[PDB]
């Protein structure tokens, strides 16, 4: 690329706008693509930028079982051995795989794990030797950290549900959906509240899923929160990641949900999985975030961009007027009453210890 130039503009993008630093640059096409790139990565790469309702957790899976194929189809050159070169190959994958959409925390941590096990294997094992354990090491990483922990959480989460509750979710969290779905099958008596928001109404698909199991549900937009919260008794939240201070990191309205719940004295239950935890720490919801294109706001009506001649459609060419839409915010711990990880129901502030319970397992 332009190299330091395009890497100096970024550090010039530091001025008045409190979003001057948020990386807007994307690649939604395979135009001018490099050749160091495996096909299945590209499909995944196009999946990220174009899928909308996807990837609270499914990315890490879809990334890993894709990674297997990469290493499977990989073969080391005759000169150097395997571990001396594999990372550089994978490093060239993620670089592309970033310009499609910035990494999640669930993905980033897994990558940080994979690069480790690469550097620790013994050289005696040959290619067909070295590959075979990685898949198991990966297939285990999937079953141990993701799926099982899910089933553990779903059990533990459904545990503290009581017959007669009225519980509230917000924008289709595949984890929390599995909870309510599991809750119905055990015969728990309750009903659910679904809060949707603009732009891409990620919540209606949760309405579909829940209704296809016969669940008394209620669909109201976020701006009506002050109303419906009186009905609610419990609040469940599936997060993108939890922070070292104990803050919950999820999509835009995740804060207001926790806020009014507190000021209405209902609990905020954060269902998140352990590997999503991060030693990262941030105070305001603007230091580290990820942007969605503001064009999607032009859609005035209740559908994805289609027959929506918004009066803003020319904002890209109207000075002093620029739209935006974060898709992640930072909710402080004072509102979160509890996080439920496969290590059990823990106080959100108890996160960073759990991370330290891994560096012991890993040397």
């Amino acid at each position: 690329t332009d190299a330091n130039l395009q890497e100096k503009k970024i550090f010039e993008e530091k001025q008045v706008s409190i979003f001057s630093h948020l990386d807007w640059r994307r690649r939604r096409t395979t135009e001018n693509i490099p050749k160091d790139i495996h096909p299945a990565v590209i499909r995944l790469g196009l999946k990220l930028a174009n899928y909308k309702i996807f990837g609270s957790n499914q990315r890490c899976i879809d990334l890993l079982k894709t990674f297997k194929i990469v290493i499977q189809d990989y073969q080391t050159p005759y000169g150097t051995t395997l571990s001396r070169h594999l990372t550089t190959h994978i490093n060239s994958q993620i670089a592309y795989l970033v310009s499609t959409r910035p990494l999640s925390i669930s993905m980033g941590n897994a990558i940080r794990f994979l690069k480790l096990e690469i550097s620790v294997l013994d050289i005696d094992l040959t290619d067909d030797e070295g590959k075979e354990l990685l898949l198991e090491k990966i297939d285990s990483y999937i079953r141990d950290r993701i799926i099982i922990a899910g089933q553990v959480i779903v059990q533990a989460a459904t545990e503290k549900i009581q017959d007669g509750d009225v519980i509230l979710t917000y924008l289709h969290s595949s984890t929390v959906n599995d909870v309510l779905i599991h809750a119905k099958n055990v015969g728990k008596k309750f009903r659910v509240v679904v809060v949707d928001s603009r732009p891409e109404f990620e919540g209606r698909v949760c309405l579909k899923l829940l209704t296809e199991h016969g669940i008394e549900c209620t669909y109201v937009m976020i701006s009506a929160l002050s109303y419906i919260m009186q009905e609610v008794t419990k609040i469940f939240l599936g997060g993108h990641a939890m922070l070292s201070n104990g803050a919950l990191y999820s999509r835009a309205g995740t804060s207001l949900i926790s806020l009014l719940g507190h000021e209405s004295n209902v609990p905020v239950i954060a269902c998140c999985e352990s590997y999503k935890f991060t030693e990262r720490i941030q105070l305001d919801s603007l230091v580290y975030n990820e942007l969605a294109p503001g064009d999607q706001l032009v859609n005035m009506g209740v559908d994805d961009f289609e027959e929506k001649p918004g009066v803003l459609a020319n904002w890209k060419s109207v000075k002093n007027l620029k739209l935006l839409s974060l898709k992640y915010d930072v909710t402080p711990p004072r509102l979160i009453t509890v996080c439920v990880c496969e290590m059990g129901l823990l106080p959100s502030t108890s996160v960073p210890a759990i991370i330290n319970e891994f560096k012991q397992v890993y040397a």
């Binding site: 009581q162 009453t337 106080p347 502030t349």
Partner: protein, 159 residues
């Protein structure tokens, strides 16, 4: 429980000044206090407190009156329970139920018109102090203020 009188004497019996306070007027006394100290009848995961009813009644005052709050707990009182709010705790008998008044007709130190044993039973015997109000929790393991190390030490107990 009426356990105050027992606590009163046992202190007075050890030659220290006492002054009983009815549970209704603790707040009026807070400005005169310099420290608040209560026992523990049970400790949950989140740092909460299970003690005799009215324990939380105090800690809110100490909070609002900007006075510290300490609770003495022995290690073998920790429990795996994790109540969400300040209410969801397993309780034997039904609690705080009402009546059904069908249309009929059955009929300043007033010291003898008190709730009978029956209607007293309808009251609960335990309240719960959330960890945000426990400035300090003292145990045989030491003093624990993190209310996350409460759990780490807890996990260290349940093998």
């Amino acid at each position: 429980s009426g356990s105050g009188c027992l606590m009163t004497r046992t202190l007075k019996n050890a030659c220290i000044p006492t002054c009983m306070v009815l549970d209704s007027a603790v707040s009026f006394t807070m400005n005169r206090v310099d420290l608040v100290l209560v026992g523990a009848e049970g400790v949950v995961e989140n740092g909460g407190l299970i003690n005799q009813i009215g324990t939380f009644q105090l800690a809110v005052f100490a909070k609002h009156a900007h006075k510290p709050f300490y609770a003495v707990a022995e290690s073998h009182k920790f429990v795996r329970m994790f109540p969400l709010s300040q209410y969801d705790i397993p309780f034997s008998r039904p609690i705080l139920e009402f009546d059904d008044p069908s249309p009929e007709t059955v009929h300043a130190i007033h010291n003898e018109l008190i709730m009978n044993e029956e209607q007293i039973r309808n009251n609960p015997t335990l309240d719960v102090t959330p960890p945000e109000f426990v400035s300090g929790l003292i145990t045989d393991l030491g003093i624990i203020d993190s209310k996350s190390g409460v759990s780490e030490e807890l996990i260290k107990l349940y093998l």
